[PDB]
DNA sequence: CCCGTGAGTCCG
DNA sequence: CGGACTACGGG
């Protein structure tokens, strides 16, 4: 599935490279272009067989995946526990306050540190997490307004969001079919809900569940995110598979 | 001789003057199927405007599921494809609202106005050659407008400033189209086109009759109870049934 | 982020 | 002379 999975991402990059954003959207980065190499290293190293479980995020945050090309790709955990590195280039148009520095980005993505710290504690080594699991985002683009502020797919005006999310809904169907996934875990309500509508519409044979999003913008994530999600994972019965 | 070429250059020149307008405010999207649906359009004019005409039917502007998809006036997909037998590649506008995508001849929707319009002529004439022997069909304005959520805006829903130069420019191209075609009689489909055409042709002193038929729009309840029956009677009264065997 | 409250569009 | 569906601010 590594090669097939990367083909789906390349075909999705092609359809997205034709969209045009505006309005409050002023910058659009695709790390699956300028951080293709560590992305493709992550997929070749960790996507070696079919998967039972897909964790699905919404999109890149500015300091993790936007820098490293790896879902929830906070720099220290990507460098040190996943052991993925690779050259990173730059978007053609950078916001000054959001330049791409790759594996030299000084900021920690809180969402990504939390997410990989959890699976690091639970699984020990990355091979144990990836025996049956994989992690991916619904949307590979990141968007800023004039002042460098992040607009998630949800903050896009409706006219710009429906366009984009229908194209990613279709790439998501293709991803789930190539990986053989039986269980999609939406990270946050938006991915959970989006994946469920999209997959049910194609009648793919797959169950869609959810865990809480780690984001620090989520006030409930700021006490005990790890403890709440260890309890959600136990309920979905995936701890089993993570040992 | 044959007006096809000249009709196209009229529309090509109107396309030019229009490409220069900036729209505002409530208007967020503007399409022009004469650019991205040029090929079926040009195929319809060449196939059916080979000779000079007695009557021009005139509509206001493309609807989102008829002419906006097929480039043919009142251009509901099934009738254009199966009755007029007009095909061509259709590409997309520069900027599309997600509720108003252009799918060309793959558009699954059947525009009610357009399906009504051509189904009348199909029943009345049999074959398209009979209807086009002396008639043709065109719109006053080739553009389509949408607000921020994809809702259609008619040319008259436009802020007066934009509305007036747009119509004035269309009026001018309409007077040429009428000259190029040779028509004795313009029938506006719906009130706006009838009135606008009367005001455009009288104001440049063209010696042409302007009449009217009810518009087939399902927004009008009288059209939903028996449009075809009303318009057959209106066409009788105008003496045009003889032209359409 | 997650949810609640509620306004634009369709009902051809 | 409503029903369903699907922006934005505060927790
Ligand atoms: O008893 C009544 C009658 C009417 N209406 C409102 C709703 C309806 O749309 C309109 C009259 O039919 O006024 C009510 O709320 N209650
Ligand atoms: O890659 C990422 C990072 C943050 N949040 C997500 O949903 N996915």
CA-closest residue to ligand 2 atom 3? A72
HSE on the CB side for B131, CA within 13 Å? 20
Burial of A87 (0-12, 13-18, 19+ CB in 10 A): exposed
Using a CB–CB cut-off of 8 Å, the residues of A that contact B are 20, 157-159, 162-163, 166
End-to-end CA distance of chain A: 23
Number of domains comprising chain A: 1
Q: Which CATH number covers residue A90? A: 3.40.470.10
Closest-lying ligand to the alpha carbon of A139?
2
Q: Which helix (H) or strand (E) holds A208?
A: strand A207-211
Taking the CB of residue B181, how many other CB atoms lie within 10 A of it? 23
Which residue, chain included where needed, has tokens 């009217």? B212
Q: What is the 3-state secondary structure (H, E, C) of chain B?
A: CCCHHHHHHHHHHHHHHHHCCCCCCCCCEEECHHHHCHHHHHHHHHHHCCCCCCEEEEECCCCCCCHHHHCCCCCCHHHHHHHHCCCCCCCCCCCCCCCCCCCHHHCCCCCHHHHHHHHHHHHHHCCHHHHHCCEEEEECCCCEEECCCCCEECHHHCCCCHHHHHHHHHHHHHHHHHHHHCCCEEEEECHHHHHHHHHHHHCCCCCCEEEEECCCCCCCHHHHHHHHHHHHHHHHHHCCCCCCC
- Is B95 in Cβ contact with A162 (below 8 Å)? no
Q: Considering only CB atoms, which chain B residues are within 8 Å of A159? A: 28, 97-98, 148-150
Nearest to A163 among B28, B98, B149 (CB): B98
- Is A162 in Cβ contact with B149 (below 8 Å)? no
Q: Please work out whether the CB of residue A186 comes within 6 Å of at least one atom of ligand 2.
A: no
Q: Ligand 2 test: best mutation among A187, A216, A229, most atoms within 8 Å of CB?
A: A187
How near does any CA of chain A get to the CA of B45, in Å?
A: 32
End-to-end CA distance of chain B: 23
Q: Please work out whether the CB of residue A185 comes within 6 Å of at least one atom of ligand 2.
A: no
Q: Provide the resolution (angstroms).
A: 2.3
Taking the CB of residue A42, how many other CB atoms lie within 10 A of it? 25
The verdict on whether residue B20 carries a ligand-binding annotation is no
- Is B150 in Cβ contact with A157 (below 8 Å)? no
- Residue B24 domain boundaries: 1-245
From residue A120, give the alpha-carbon distance in Å to each of A13, A70, A80, A104, A226. 30, 16, 11, 22, 12
Q: Considering only CB atoms, which chain B residues are within 8 Å of A166? A: 98
- What is the full DSSP assignment across A84-147? --------SS--TTS---GGG--SPPHHHHHHHHHHHHHHSSHHHHHTTEEEEES---EEE-TT
Cα of A118 to ligand 1 centre, how many Å?
56
Of A136, A155, A138, nearest to A194 by C-alpha is: A138
Q: For residue B108, give every residue at least 6 positions away whose Cβ sits within 8 Å of its Cβ, in sequence order, or none.
A: none
How near does any CA of chain A get to the CA of B29, in Å?
A: 11
- Tell which of B29, B95, B98 to mutate to test the A interface (max A CBs under 10 Å): B98
- Is A159 in Cβ contact with B150 (below 8 Å)? yes
Q: Considering only CB atoms, which chain A residues are within 8 Å of B95? A: 20
Strands A53-57 and A133-137 turn out to be: parallel
Strand pairing partners for A183? A53, A207
Method: X-ray
How near does any CA of chain B get to the CA of A20, in Å?
A: 8
Q: What is the 3-state secondary structure (H, E, C) of A54-84?
A: EEEECCCCCCCHHHHCCCCCCHHHHHHHHCC
Report the nearest residue to nucleotide D6, CA vs C1'.
A158
The verdict on whether residue A137 carries a ligand-binding annotation is yes
């Amino acid at each position: 599935p590594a090669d097939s999975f990367l083909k789906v991402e390349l075909e999705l990059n092609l359809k997205l490279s034709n969209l045009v954003f505006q309005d409050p959207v002023q910058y659009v980065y695709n790390p699956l272009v300028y951080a293709w190499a560590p992305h493709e290293n992550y997929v070749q190293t960790y996507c070696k067989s079919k998967k039972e479980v897909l964790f699905l995020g919404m999109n890149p945050g500015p300091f993790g995946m936007a820098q490293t090309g790896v879902p929830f790709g906070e720099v220290n955990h990507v460098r040190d526990w996943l052991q993925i590195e690779g050259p990173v280039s730059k978007p053609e148009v950078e916001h000054p306050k959001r330049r791409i520095r790759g594996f030299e980005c000084p900021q920690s993505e809180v969402s990504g540190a939390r997410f990989w710290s959890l699976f690091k504690s639970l699984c020990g080594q990355p091979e144990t997490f990836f025996k049956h699991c994989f992690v991916h985002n619904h949307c590979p683009l990141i968007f800023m307004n004039h002042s460098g502020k992040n607009l998630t797919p949800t903050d896009l005006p409706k006219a710009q969001r429906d366009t984009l999310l229908e194209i990613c809904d279709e790439a998501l169907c293709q991803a789930v079919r190539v990986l053989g996934v039986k269980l999609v875990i939406g990270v946050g309500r938006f991915s959970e809900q989006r994946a469920r509508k999209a997959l049910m519409a194609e009648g793919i044979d797959v169950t869609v569940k959810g865990i809480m999003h780690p984001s620090p913008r989520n006030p409930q994530a700021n006490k005990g995110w790890e403890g709440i999600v260890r309890g959600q994972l136990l309920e979905l019965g995936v701890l089993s598979l993570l040992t």
